[PDB]
Amino acid sequence: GADNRELWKVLNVDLEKHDEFLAPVPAVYRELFLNRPNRPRAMAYFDAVVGDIHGIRVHELYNLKQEGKKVFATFCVYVPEEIINATGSACIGLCGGAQYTVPAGETVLPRNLCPLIKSAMGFKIERICPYFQVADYVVGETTCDGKKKAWEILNEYIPVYVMELPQKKEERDRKFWEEEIKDFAQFVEEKTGVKLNAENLRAGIEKINKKRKALKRLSDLRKHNPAPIHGLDVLLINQLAFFDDPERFATKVNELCDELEERVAKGEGVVSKDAPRILITGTPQPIPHWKIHALIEGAGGVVVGEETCIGERYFKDLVEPAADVEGMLKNIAARSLKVNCACFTPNTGRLEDILSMVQKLQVDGVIHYSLQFCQPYGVESYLVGRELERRNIPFLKLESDFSEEDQGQLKTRIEAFLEMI
Amino acid sequence: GADNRELWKVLNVDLEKHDEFLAPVPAVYRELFLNRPNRPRAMAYFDAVVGDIHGIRVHELYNLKQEGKKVFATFCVYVPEEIINATGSACIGLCGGAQYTVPAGETVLPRNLCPLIKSAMGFKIERICPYFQVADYVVGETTCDGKKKAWEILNEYIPVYVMELPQKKEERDRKFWEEEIKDFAQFVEEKTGVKLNAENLRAGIEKINKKRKALKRLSDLRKHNPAPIHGLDVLLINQLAFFDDPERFATKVNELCDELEERVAKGEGVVSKDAPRILITGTPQPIPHWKIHALIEGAGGVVVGEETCIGERYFKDLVEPAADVEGMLKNIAARSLKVNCACFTPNTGRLEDILSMVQKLQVDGVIHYSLQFCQPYGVESYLVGRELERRNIPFLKLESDFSEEDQGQLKTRIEAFLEMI
Numbered sequence: 001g002a003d004n005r006e007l008w009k010v011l012n013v014d015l016e017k018h019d020e021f022l023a024p025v026p027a028v029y030r031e032l033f034l035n036r037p038n039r040p041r042a043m044a045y046f047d048a049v050v051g052d053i054h055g056i057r058v059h060e061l062y063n064l065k066q067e068g069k070k071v072f073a074t075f076c077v078y079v080p081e082e083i084i085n086a087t088g089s090a091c092i093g094l095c096g097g098a099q100y101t102v103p104a105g106e107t108v109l110p111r112n113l114c115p116l117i118k119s120a121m122g123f124k125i126e127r128i129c130p131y132f133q134v135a136d137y138v139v140g141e142t143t144c145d146g147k148k149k150a151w152e153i154l155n156e157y158i159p160v161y162v163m164e165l166p167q168k169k170e171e172r173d174r175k176f177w178e179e180e181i182k183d184f185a186q187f188v189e190e191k192t193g194v195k196l197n198a199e200n201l202r203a204g205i206e207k208i209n210k211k212r213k214a215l216k217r218l219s220d221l222r223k224h225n226p227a228p229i230h231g232l233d234v235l236l237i238n239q240l241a242f243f244d245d246p247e248r249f250a251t252k253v254n255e256l257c258d259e260l261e262e263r264v265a266k267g268e269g270v271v272s273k274d275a276p277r278i279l280i281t282g283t284p285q286p287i288p289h290w291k292i293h294a295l296i297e298g299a300g301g302v303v304v305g306e307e308t309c310i311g312e313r314y315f316k317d318l319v320e321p322a323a324d325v326e327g328m329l330k331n332i333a334a335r336s337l338k339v340n341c342a343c344f345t346p347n348t349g350r351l352e353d354i355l356s357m358v359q360k361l362q363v364d365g366v367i368h369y370s371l372q373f374c375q376p377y378g379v380e381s382y383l384v385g386r387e388l389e390r391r392n393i394p395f396l397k398l399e400s401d402f403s404e405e406d407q408g409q410l411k412t413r414i415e416a417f418l419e420m421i
Numbered sequence: 422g423a424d425n426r427e428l429w430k431v432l433n434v435d436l437e438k439h440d441e442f443l444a445p446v447p448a449v450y451r452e453l454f455l456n457r458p459n460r461p462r463a464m465a466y467f468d469a470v471v472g473d474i475h476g477i478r479v480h481e482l483y484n485l486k487q488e489g490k491k492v493f494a495t496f497c498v499y500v501p502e503e504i505i506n507a508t509g510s511a512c513i514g515l516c517g518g519a520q521y522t523v524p525a526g527e528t529v530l531p532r533n534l535c536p537l538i539k540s541a542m543g544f545k546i547e548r549i550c551p552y553f554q555v556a557d558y559v560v561g562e563t564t565c566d567g568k569k570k571a572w573e574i575l576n577e578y579i580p581v582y583v584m585e586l587p588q589k590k591e592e593r594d595r596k597f598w599e600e601e602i603k604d605f606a607q608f609v610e611e612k613t614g615v616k617l618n619a620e621n622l623r624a625g626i627e628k629i630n631k632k633r634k635a636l637k638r639l640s641d642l643r644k645h646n647p648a649p650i651h652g653l654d655v656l657l658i659n660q661l662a663f664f665d666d667p668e669r670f671a672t673k674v675n676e677l678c679d680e681l682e683e684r685v686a687k688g689e690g691v692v693s694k695d696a697p698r699i700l701i702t703g704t705p706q707p708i709p710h711w712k713i714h715a716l717i718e719g720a721g722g723v724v725v726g727e728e729t730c731i732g733e734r735y736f737k738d739l740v741e742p743a744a745d746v747e748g749m750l751k752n753i754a755a756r757s758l759k760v761n762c763a764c765f766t767p768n769t770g771r772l773e774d775i776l777s778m779v780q781k782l783q784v785d786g787v788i789h790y791s792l793q794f795c796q797p798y799g800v801e802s803y804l805v806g807r808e809l810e811r812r813n814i815p816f817l818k819l820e821s822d823f824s825e826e827d828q829g830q831l832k833t834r835i836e837a838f839l840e841m842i
């Protein structure tokens with residue numbers, strides 16, 4: 001309603017460009033979501049979030065700031081949400097998923113860079129995103145080359161705190177990352193004016209753990225045949241995890257899981273039991289980058305898992321409680337270092353994660369999907385494919401960007417792969 | 422002569438592919454080097470190295486191995502040559518510069534990756550390079566994404582020791598890198614069977630310092646007008662630093678510098694005093710990647726410096742002596758961490774390095790040149806160009822690969838830039 005436009009003006013949103021970004025979303029969401037039959041009734045909450053994606057939650061974040069709290073924007077699962085949450089402040093994940101802002105990003109970034117990075121840069125530099133406009137700080141991290149060097153540029157438009165993630169997981173790395181988490185905690189305390197204590201850090205941990213546990217519950221339900229829910233609906237929910245209130249989100253996710261239990265009991269699903277079941281592995285797919293799932297599932301397959309950070313790598317690992325602040329900070333650091341991202345070397349644990357999901361989810365085929373110019377995941381795909389093919393697990397390597405130019409060629413290749421199996 | 426082919430057979434070189442790689446080099450070297458007038462007489466040593474590039478030095482390395490010494494191959498200036506040299510073993514830098522092997526690299530690497538990496542991989546996996554075939558070990562490093570993940574694959578064909586370079590230069594990083602250097606020293610001691618002591622580490626330091634000091638002497642001579650030597654000849658010498666015997670090399674480099682002193686005194690050069698003087702900044706240009714210099718200088722310009730690791734970043738910083746092994750290892754670590762590579766964040770020191778060379782070398786224009794898909798240098802070029810243009814220093818951003826397809830478009834763009842100034 002009009003009060004959203006009122007808030008966008010206050011936030012110095014470029015109203016005309018922002019309207020252009022959202023303009024095609026309603027028809028896309030009807031094609032890929034609303035007109036698709038057999039969807040759980042409990043998808044209505046998430047559908048309404050999408051319909052008001054820059055409305056109610058942006059108002060909440062703005063009102064939090066009037067109460068003296070802060071809004072932190074992050075781009076990686078390694079940044080400790082628990083520490084931000086402990087202070088009463090908000091954490092939002094703003095990885096880009098939109099072709100519309102990629103040109104704006106290219107005004108300061110190379111064209112041959114990950115479109116996640118280019119899209120995010122474009123949102124902020126042109127003031128197109130109400131979330132980016134309500135953020136107080138960005139927390140950057142030293143993962144891939146493009147992100148690391150992009151923060152140096154972005155810092156000119158919004159303050160970027162750069163967390164140094166190590167590149168191995170040996171003992172020296174683990175201690176290094178512990179110290180990085182301590183330095184970040186001190187930064188959060190200073191910007192918020194709220195000191196961490198045993199009580200508030202325990203509660204921050206519990207709040208984020210409860211969100212991960214709901215998404216984990218949902219992921220496990222997908223092991224059933226027939227698939228009780230289309231994977232594209234789960235991708236959407238995993239995407240929305242990065243914007244929503246953590247407690248409301250966890251509640252609505254659990255409401256959905258209840259309805260899916262009903263389905264699994266009656267043997268009801270969204271697809272035939274003979275429908276090929278697909279595991280996606282690779283890079284995160286931020287909202288509204290629905291292309292790959294929509295092609296797989298429009299072709300009669302069903303995606304039953306995502307081994308990605310908008311997916312399993314986000315929610316698998318929970319923080320282990322500890323008795324004091326120092327122990328809780330150590331365990332928060334330890335939780336993030338369980339994430340088997342391709343920026344680490346070696347990364348053999350991710351392969352065990354993929355193979356474990358293949359077994360657990362009764363997967364007929366693995367699609368390895370990584371964004372164009374993502375070099376960590378592009379390179380690592382060779383060793384991943386080799387072990388999957390040694391085990392005669394069907395394997396398709398796909399790469400794309402946020403544009404629609406290659407929809408046709410991707411569609412054919414996916415169709416050929418699903419026919420083969 | 423025939424004894425080179427004898428050695429290549431012993432080394433399991435693919436003789437037919439190796440002949441194909443070298444086949445076009447003689448005519449290219451005549452066009453770009455031998456038929457170019459006004460070259461110092463002392464270029465004859467380096468010319469003869471090129472003519473026998475897989476001959477005499479490969480024999481020396483092979484004979485060193487029969488004497489119980491080892492050959493280490495490296496791909497980054499951060500790897501401590503001084504520690505290898507201390508044991509009597511050899512260090513050779515095998516960064517790729519050749520289109521010919523890029524396809525072979527793509528049998529296990531993505532096409533959208535740095536051609537330096539693809540070319541090196543192809544040399545080893547197809548056994549085309551006698552240096553790679555005589556190497557005992559590769560020392561890899563965690564710099565760019567493509568190198569880091571490529572080592573995991575390369576390790577299957579030759580043992581790769583991976584050194585973890587940090588991503589910032591804060592105190593925690595400096596101590597981390599010190600420990601990495603200690604762990605590397607222990608690896609070198611174990612593989613060579615030679616323990617480091619005060620005497621042999623002091624001598625390793627002196628030997629590599631003397632090589633850096635000769636290249637530094639040569640770089641400083643280029644500040645003169647008219648330019649006493651074409652920059653393409655200096656690029657070649659800087660490239661050959663990574664293969665040659667360090668003591669012979671330093672001697673022959675100094676012989677050249679003497680002859681250039683003669684020229685500078687008589688006011689003699691290779692170009693008119695009115696010829697535009699160019700500083701190249703960006704990624705290293707490994708042998709035989711002569712394309713960019715040859716275009717600049719064929720168009721009437723003269724390259725007077727290279728702010729690259731085959732160039733100034735290699736030789737600027739000398740190791741500070743210390744009294745004991747522990748102090749020498751600390752200072753060896755400290756020397757490498759002075760290198761202002763774009764894999765570090767921030768990297769404002771490299772900009773001061775560029776601006777310092779602009780002043781010192783009386784530069785009329787800066788060409789920023791980075792290899793295709795090198796994301797650290799590609800991204801950082803934006804901040805570099807901004808400060809140079811704020812100072813109204815003429816600035817041209819160029820990117821290319823090892824192919825010849827774009828010679829024409831590069832030639833025109835370079836010509837337009839040199840005309841403008």
